[PDB]
CSV table of C-alpha atoms in Angstrom, one decimal:
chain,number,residue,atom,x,y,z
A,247,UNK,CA,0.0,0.0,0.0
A,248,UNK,CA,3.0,2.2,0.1
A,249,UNK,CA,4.5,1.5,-2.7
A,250,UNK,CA,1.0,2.1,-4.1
A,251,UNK,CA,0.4,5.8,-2.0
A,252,UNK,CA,3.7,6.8,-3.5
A,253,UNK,CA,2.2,5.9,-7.2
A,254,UNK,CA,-0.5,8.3,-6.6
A,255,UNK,CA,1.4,11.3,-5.0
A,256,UNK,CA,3.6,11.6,-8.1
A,257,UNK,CA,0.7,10.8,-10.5
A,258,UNK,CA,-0.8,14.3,-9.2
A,259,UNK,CA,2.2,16.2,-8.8
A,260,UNK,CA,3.0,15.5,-12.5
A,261,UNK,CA,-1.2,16.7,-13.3
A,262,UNK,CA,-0.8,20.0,-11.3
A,263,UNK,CA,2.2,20.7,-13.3
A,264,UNK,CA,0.7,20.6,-16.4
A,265,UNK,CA,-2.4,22.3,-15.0
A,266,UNK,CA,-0.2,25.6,-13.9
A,267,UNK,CA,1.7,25.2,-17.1
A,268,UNK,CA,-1.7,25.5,-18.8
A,269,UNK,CA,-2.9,28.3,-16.6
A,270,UNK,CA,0.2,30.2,-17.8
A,271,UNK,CA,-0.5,30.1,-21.3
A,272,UNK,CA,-3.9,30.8,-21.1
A,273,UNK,CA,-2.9,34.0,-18.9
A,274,UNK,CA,-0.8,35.2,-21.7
A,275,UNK,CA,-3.0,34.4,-24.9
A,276,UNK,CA,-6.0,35.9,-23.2
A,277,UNK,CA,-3.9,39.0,-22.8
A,278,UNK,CA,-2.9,39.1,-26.4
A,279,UNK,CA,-6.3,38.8,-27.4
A,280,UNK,CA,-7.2,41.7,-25.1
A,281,UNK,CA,-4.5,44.2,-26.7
A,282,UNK,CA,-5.2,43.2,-30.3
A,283,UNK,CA,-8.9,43.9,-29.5
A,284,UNK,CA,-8.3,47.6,-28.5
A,285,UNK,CA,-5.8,47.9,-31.4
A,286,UNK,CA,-8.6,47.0,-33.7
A,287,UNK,CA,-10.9,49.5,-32.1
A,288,UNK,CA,-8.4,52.5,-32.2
A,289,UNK,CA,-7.6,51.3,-36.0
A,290,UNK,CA,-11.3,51.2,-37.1
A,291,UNK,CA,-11.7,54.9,-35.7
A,292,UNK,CA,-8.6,55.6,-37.1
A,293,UNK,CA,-10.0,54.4,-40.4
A,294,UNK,CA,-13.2,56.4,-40.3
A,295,UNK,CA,-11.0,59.8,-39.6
A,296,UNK,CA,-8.8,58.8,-42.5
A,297,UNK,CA,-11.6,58.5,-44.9
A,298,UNK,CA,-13.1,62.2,-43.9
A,299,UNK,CA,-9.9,63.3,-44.4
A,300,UNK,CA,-9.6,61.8,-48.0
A,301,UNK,CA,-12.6,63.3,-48.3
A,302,UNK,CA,-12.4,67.2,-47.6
A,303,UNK,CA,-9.0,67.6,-49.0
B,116,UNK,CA,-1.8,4.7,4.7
B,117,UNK,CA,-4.5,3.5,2.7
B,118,UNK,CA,-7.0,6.6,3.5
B,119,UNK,CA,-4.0,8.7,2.2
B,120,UNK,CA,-3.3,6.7,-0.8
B,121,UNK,CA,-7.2,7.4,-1.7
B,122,UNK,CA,-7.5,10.6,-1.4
B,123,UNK,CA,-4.3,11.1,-3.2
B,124,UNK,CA,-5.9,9.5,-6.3
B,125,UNK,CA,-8.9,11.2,-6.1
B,126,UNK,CA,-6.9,14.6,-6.1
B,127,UNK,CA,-5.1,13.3,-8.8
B,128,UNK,CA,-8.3,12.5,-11.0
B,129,UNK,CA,-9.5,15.9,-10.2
B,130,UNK,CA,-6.3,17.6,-11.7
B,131,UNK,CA,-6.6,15.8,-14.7
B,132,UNK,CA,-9.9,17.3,-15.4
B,133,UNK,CA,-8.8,20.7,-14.6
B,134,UNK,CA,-5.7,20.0,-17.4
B,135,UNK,CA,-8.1,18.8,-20.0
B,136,UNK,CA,-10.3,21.9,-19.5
B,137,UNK,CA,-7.3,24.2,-19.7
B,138,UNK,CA,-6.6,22.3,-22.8
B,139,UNK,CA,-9.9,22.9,-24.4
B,140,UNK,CA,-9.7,26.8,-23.3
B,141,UNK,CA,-6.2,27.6,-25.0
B,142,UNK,CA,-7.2,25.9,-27.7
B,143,UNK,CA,-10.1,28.4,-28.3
B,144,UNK,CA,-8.4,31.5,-27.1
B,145,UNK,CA,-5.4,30.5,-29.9
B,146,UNK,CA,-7.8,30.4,-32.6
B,147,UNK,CA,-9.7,33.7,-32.1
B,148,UNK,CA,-5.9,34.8,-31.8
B,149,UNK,CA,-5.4,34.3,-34.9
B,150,UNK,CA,-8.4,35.6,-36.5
B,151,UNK,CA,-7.9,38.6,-34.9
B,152,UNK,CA,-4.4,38.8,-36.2
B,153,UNK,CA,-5.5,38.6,-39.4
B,154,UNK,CA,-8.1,41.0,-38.5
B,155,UNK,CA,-5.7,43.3,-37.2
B,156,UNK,CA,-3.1,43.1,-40.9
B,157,UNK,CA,-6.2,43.4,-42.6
B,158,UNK,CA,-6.5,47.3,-41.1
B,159,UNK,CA,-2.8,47.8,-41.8
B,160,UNK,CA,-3.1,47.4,-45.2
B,161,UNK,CA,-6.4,49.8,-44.8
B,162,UNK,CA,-4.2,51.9,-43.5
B,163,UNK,CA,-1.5,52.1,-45.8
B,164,UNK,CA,-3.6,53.1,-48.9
B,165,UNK,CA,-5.3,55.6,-47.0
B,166,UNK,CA,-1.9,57.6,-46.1
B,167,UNK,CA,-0.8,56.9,-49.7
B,168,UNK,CA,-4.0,59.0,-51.2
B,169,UNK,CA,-3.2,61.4,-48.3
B,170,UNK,CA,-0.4,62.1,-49.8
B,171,UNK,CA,-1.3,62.4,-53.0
B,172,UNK,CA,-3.9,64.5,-52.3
């Protein structure tokens, strides 16, 4: 039963591992997806001021 | 030693489910990465052609 117990405690050491590896990268993707976001807001105003500007010159 | 060994298997079960649904989540997050990326090169080019007929103008 030992032997056995010591099975188990590395079986979920190795799954929490790859569970806060996984929580990392999601961190940082989610973040990327949140700056590209406001880029593409700030670039579709953008867009609209360059058209009126094409426009009245 | 075999109450331990239990509940250490039963954690370890639970972390694997928390991994494949970290899995599943920056699998999502990459794509709509990537759609925004392309999204986002899309305005750039947008961008360039409107400075171009700036100038021109």
């Amino acid at each position: 039963i030992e032997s056995d117990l010591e099975r188990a405690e590395e079986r979920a050491e190795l799954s929490e591992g790859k569970c806060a590896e996984l929580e990392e990268e999601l961190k940082t993707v989610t973040n990327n997806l949140k700056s590209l976001e406001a880029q593409a807001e700030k670039y579709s105003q953008k867009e609209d001021k360059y058209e009126e500007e094409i426009k009245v010159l």
